[PDB]
Amino acid sequence: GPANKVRFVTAASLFDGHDASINIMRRILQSQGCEVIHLGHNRSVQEVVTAALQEDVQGIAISSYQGGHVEYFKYMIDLLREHGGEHIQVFGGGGGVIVPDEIRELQAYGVARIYSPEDGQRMGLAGMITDMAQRCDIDLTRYAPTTLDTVVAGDRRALAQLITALENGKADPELVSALHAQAKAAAVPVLGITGTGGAGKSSLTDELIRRFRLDQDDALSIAVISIDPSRRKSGGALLGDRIRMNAINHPNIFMRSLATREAGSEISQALPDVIAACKAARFDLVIVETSGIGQGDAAIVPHVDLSLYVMTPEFGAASQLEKIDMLDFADFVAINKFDRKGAQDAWRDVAKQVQRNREQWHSRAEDMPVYGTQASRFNDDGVTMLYQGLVGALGARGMSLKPGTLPNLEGRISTGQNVIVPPARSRYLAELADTVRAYHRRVVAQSKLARERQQLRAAHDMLQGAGHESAALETLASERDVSLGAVERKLLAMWPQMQQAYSGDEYVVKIRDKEIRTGLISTTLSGTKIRKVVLPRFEDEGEILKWLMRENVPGSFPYTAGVFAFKREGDPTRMFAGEGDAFRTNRRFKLVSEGMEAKRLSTAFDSVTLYGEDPHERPDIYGKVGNSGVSIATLEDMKVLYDGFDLTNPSTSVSMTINGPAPTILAMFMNTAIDQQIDRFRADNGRDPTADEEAKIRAWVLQNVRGTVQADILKEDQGQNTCIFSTEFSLKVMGDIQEYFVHHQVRNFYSVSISGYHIAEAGANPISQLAFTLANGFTYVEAYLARGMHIDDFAPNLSFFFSNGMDPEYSVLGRVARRIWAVTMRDKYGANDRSQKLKYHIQTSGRSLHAQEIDFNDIRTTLQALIAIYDNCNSLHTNAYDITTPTAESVRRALAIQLIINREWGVAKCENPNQGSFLIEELTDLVEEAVLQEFERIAERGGVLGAMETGYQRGKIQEESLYYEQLKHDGTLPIIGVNTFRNPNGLARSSEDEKQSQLHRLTEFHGAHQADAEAMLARLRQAVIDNRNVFAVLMDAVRVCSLGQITHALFEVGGQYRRNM
């Protein structure tokens, strides 16, 4: 029970994906009656400190679930003691990450308060909350400014103390009326923004602020005040509107979040005084967001100079406008979230209604200053049109403003252009599932017809063999012969030869002009001859054809037995290695790639690079520099990293793991590949290669461009929820660079990486993982199809990665996926078979893999590998902790297992370990049906776009985790070594000097490009404004810009993700 209004802040550290615990914590806090401004996850320390200082909050709540917090705590304490934040309480708690030794270190350091897991369990959360709240009983009235110097200068701390005085009424009322007089002499613009809270008005304000920043060159002093209703029961409120604001990145731009603090009134009673304070604070513009509005309230309109109303297409009947007197006084009206149906009709109706109200029959209703807009889509045309209309109104309102530097885009309606998804394309998933059903139906029908024909045939033969002359038999047989389908009859016709061709001990293939004859006989120690693939030996043809249609031989559509007709011959020991600087990594490569014919390198990076984070003098990342991955600053670092390794060699394979800035790294890789050849030719000639030599190098690189990239932006959004770029724009860039590749006929490189590894590690049931992956891949196909690209051109290069768990579902799941994939390619699009064949990678179980009794987990992994061997996996992966070092002991065990599979298993010499079992096919079909059902469920939910928009997969993983953990705790789930058979008896760091050297290299790169930095910025902005294929611009910018600069520019353009959910 605080005497005053207490303000608290909860937030998560940078690079944090898990915030549900802090979410429930903040729920309890606001339930207690605490006013909290939460900033979500991955928030800059400087940004959070600035926000807290400008908002003048009383307490700070911290949840540190990822470690490394100590730097942030120390820096924040130093800054608070530096900027008068010692009296502002700071509280933290992050579970068991803080070791009790670390707890003692923090306590002796001088931390305000750290909550131990033992303390959290014993004392309880409510008691701690009450203790803190009663502890925050501090008087801020002594902090109120006594003079007018701070107010005139614009000290927003002084203005916040003034707001507190207004709340307490302790301000000198004569001084307040004098402030009103000063505002009357000032008269700076005040914009009233009216509409429902959280509808997207924050995104609109963010985009408009960004537009004004770019047009007027960051020259606007913007003061923002938000008033929100107070929960009459609790008395507190969560000021969750500043959180969506991200374009406030300017010291002279200020924002304040406030409550109504009135039991009956929905607005603050001192709001005009706040307006006068902002006007006298020498702010070039004041923007106000209203609270939850009713029907006939129009109190804010006379208190502001311009009125802006926010509306949505959903408003009920058109007669609901007959009761909105607020709209009778709204100077500007905008229809928010134009993505829903009927929006254009409603716009026409409202325009007609306004025309009737104003009796302006001589004017055009569509020309009225009311626009329909969709806030979620970036670069919205209606947003630019409304900004232009606002500029025109300000000119009409007599606003001395700098001339517009932006092109004058015409119109009044956002057209939804650059919409990757075709609006109608959507329910494609149900279409595909129905196609699968129809394929099954047709297969059954054809099998039945062919069986009937065969039965009639043999019956006639026996009867004609019995001597009886019956002409009805041949007529009836012919009735089925024409009924028999042509393609099936062709497949029916092929049975005798292939049956005989594979009956022998050796298969011969005269390929092109040469011949490929390979023996088919395998011999055991007892001398028994083993055919590698043995076919069913049935007599009746109906079931034969049914099998063939449903299950062909390997290498035959739909490649159910695998894509490759015969097993690959052969040690693809993947060389995954990377840490520290270039020198250590190159030494390690020399260790691994010493005298190796085929270079198969796998490259990992630190999250700082994986997040595209520029190295910074802030210690927040300093402990993370060179940790768990190589931090790259410039192209030369990569070129040195690739010194002495002939990447143009066809046996040289490199697999790098990054998703977001991956095109930038690929551009750098192209630079390195070209530079190697150019420098070699220059040394070979003692002269610079000419433009003809440049074109020759270009064509040669296009010929020999080979590589693998582990990029998947989507999966970060599914499990980390840390994505920063709009996935729409990211996939647009993906399409642009893919278009470059097609235009450049890139044929040997691989950049797409679709996986379920984090999906599987999330605890996702395999069926859902499969279905979601299929949806994502086919939506990618549609997007590329929405790009007007031939399906067959890029499908062969499309890649997949899977993780294999324990359930009996995993037994055939890969085969089912292969079977459905081919028919999806064939029926819907009919791309060439080379596109229809699937390539994939398989990973063992990681979710069931645990340090708790890993010894038996190894034997479980044996079972895991069993199926993938029977499933004939083309690529098997065993997870590496690279956390503890992935020691060579595990690799020794895994390679031993692989060799045992390859040789020691005689059953492995067969190539059809699963064909025949009725259990197998029944499991297959039931799994098929279940996957279809899930597809229909997601298709019925508004497609992948809606499922991601609302968080469908979030609920999926939540339910799966809850059910699994309940089975685990109940003991119903039997677990070896945990729930059963209990035991009767029972870190790489880089020197800071290396980081400083790399930082010096990067700054020298900046110093090499500081004079030409303006040219690079202009080039970037030219790429930005036209919304073209940026990679063309990126091809040269990478040579003159660091990746951190690129990310900064991408965030500056407005591509930053706003936590608006």
Annotated binding-site residue numbers for substrate: 566, 600, 706, 750, 799, 834, 839
The amino acid sitting at 289 is E
Residue among 321 and 1040 whose Cβ is closer to a copy of itself: 321
Can you say whether residue 364 is alpha, beta or left, with left for phi > 0 and alpha for psi between -120 and 50 degrees? beta
Residue among 292 and 623 whose Cβ is closer to a copy of itself: 292
Q: Rule CB under 8 A: choose which of 68, 145, 154, 197 binds a copy of itself.
A: 197
Near a copy of itself in 1015-1054, by CB under 8 A? none
d(CA 379, CA 386): 12
CB of 904 to a copy of itself, least distance (A): 28
Residues at the binding site for GTP are 198-203, 244, 336-339, 949, 1060
d(CA 436, CA 931): 11
Near a copy of itself in 934-993, by CB under 8 A? 941-942, 946, 950, 952, 955, 963-964, 967, 973
DSSP annotation of 580 reads S
Looking at the DSSP bridge assignments, the partners of residue 335 are 311, 372
CB of 422 to a copy of itself, least distance (A): 19
Q: How many CB atoms lie within 10 A of CB 661?
A: 23
Looking at the DSSP bridge assignments, the partners of residue 345 are none
Residue span 354-373 as binding mask against a copy of itself, x where in contact by CB under 8 A, dash where not:
--x-----------------
Residue among 723 and 767 whose Cβ is closer to a copy of itself: 767
Question: What is the DSSP pairing of strand 506-509 with strand 516-519?
Answer: antiparallel
Residue among 545 and 1046 whose Cβ is closer to a copy of itself: 545
**What SS3 class is residue 802?**
strand
Residue among 199 and 866 whose Cβ is closer to a copy of itself: 199
Near a copy of itself in 214-253, by CB under 8 A? 228-233, 237-238, 240
Near a copy of itself in 886-915, by CB under 8 A? none
CB of 75 to a copy of itself, least distance (A): 30
Q: Rule CB under 8 A: choose which of 70, 79, 530, 897 binds a copy of itself.
A: 530
d(CA 761, CA 718): 12
90's CB contacts (< 8 A; 6+ apart) are 59, 60, 62, 73, 76, 77, 80, 111, 112, 113
1017's CB contacts (< 8 A; 6+ apart) are 1049
Residue 438 touches a copy of itself, criterion: CB under 8 A: no
Residue 198 touches a copy of itself, criterion: CB under 8 A: yes
Which residue has 């996986």 as its token pair? 755
Residue 316 touches a copy of itself, criterion: CB under 8 A: yes
Q: Rule CB under 8 A: choose which of 296, 395, 555, 572 binds a copy of itself.
A: 296
Near a copy of itself in 255-284, by CB under 8 A? 264, 266
- Residue 36's closest CA among 555, 28, 409? 28
Stretch that binds a copy of itself, among 340-348, 411-419, 491-499, 695-703 (CB under 8 A): 340-348
CB of 608 to a copy of itself, least distance (A): 32
The amino acid sitting at 930 is A
Preceding peptide of 558 cis, ω within 30°: yes
- Residue 205's closest CA among 224, 227, 231? 224
Question: How far does Cα 500 stand from its chain's mean position?
Answer: 52
Stretch that binds a copy of itself, among 45-53, 435-443, 470-478, 520-528 (CB under 8 A): 520-528
Residue 616 touches a copy of itself, criterion: CB under 8 A: no
Q: Rule CB under 8 A: choose which of 118, 328, 366, 643 binds a copy of itself.
A: 328
Q: Where the chain is broken, by preceding residue (C–N > 2.5 Å)?
A: 570, 882, 986
Number of residues that bind a copy of itself (CB under 8 A): 80
d(CA 422, CA 947): 17
Residue among 32 and 704 whose Cβ is closer to a copy of itself: 32
Residue among 526 and 983 whose Cβ is closer to a copy of itself: 526
Near a copy of itself in 146-175, by CB under 8 A? none
Residue 523 touches a copy of itself, criterion: CB under 8 A: no
Looking at the DSSP bridge assignments, the partners of residue 980 are 976
- 28-29-32 Cα angle (round to 5): 85
CB of 951 to a copy of itself, least distance (A): 9
405's CB contacts (< 8 A; 6+ apart) are 214, 215, 216, 217
Near a copy of itself in 765-794, by CB under 8 A? 765, 767
Residue among 229 and 369 whose Cβ is closer to a copy of itself: 229
CB of 504 to a copy of itself, least distance (A): 25
Please state the φ and ψ torsions of residue 695, each to the nearest 5 degrees.
Answer: -65, -40
d(CA 910, CA 916): 14
Residue 137 touches a copy of itself, criterion: CB under 8 A: no
Stretch that binds a copy of itself, among 195-203, 362-370, 748-756, 773-781 (CB under 8 A): 195-203
Stretch that binds a copy of itself, among 167-175, 522-530, 662-670, 824-832 (CB under 8 A): 522-530
Residue 808 touches a copy of itself, criterion: CB under 8 A: yes
512's CB contacts (< 8 A; 6+ apart) are none
Which residue has 């959070």 as its token pair? 48
Residue span 534-573 as binding mask against a copy of itself, x where in contact by CB under 8 A, dash where not:
xxxxxxx-xx------------------------------
Residues at the binding site are 18, 198-203, 227-228, 241, 244, 289-290, 336-339, 566, 600, 706, 750, 799, 834, 839, 949, 1060
Residue 918 touches a copy of itself, criterion: CB under 8 A: yes
Structure tokens at 123: 């004392």
CB of 844 to a copy of itself, least distance (A): 18
Stretch that binds a copy of itself, among 190-198, 407-415, 479-487, 1038-1046 (CB under 8 A): 190-198
Counting every residue written for the chain, the total comes to: 1061
Near a copy of itself in 1-40, by CB under 8 A? 27, 30
CA atoms within 13 A on the CB side of 959: 8
Question: What is the DSSP pairing of strand 35-36 with strand 7-12?
Answer: parallel
Roughly what angle, to the nearest 10 degrees, separates helices 766-786 and 428-465? 100
CB of 761 to a copy of itself, least distance (A): 17
CB of 715 to a copy of itself, least distance (A): 22
Stretch that binds a copy of itself, among 6-14, 323-331, 553-561, 645-653 (CB under 8 A): 323-331
| CB contact at 8 A, 745 and 701 | no
**What SS3 class is residue 601?**
strand
d(CA 460, CA 449): 16
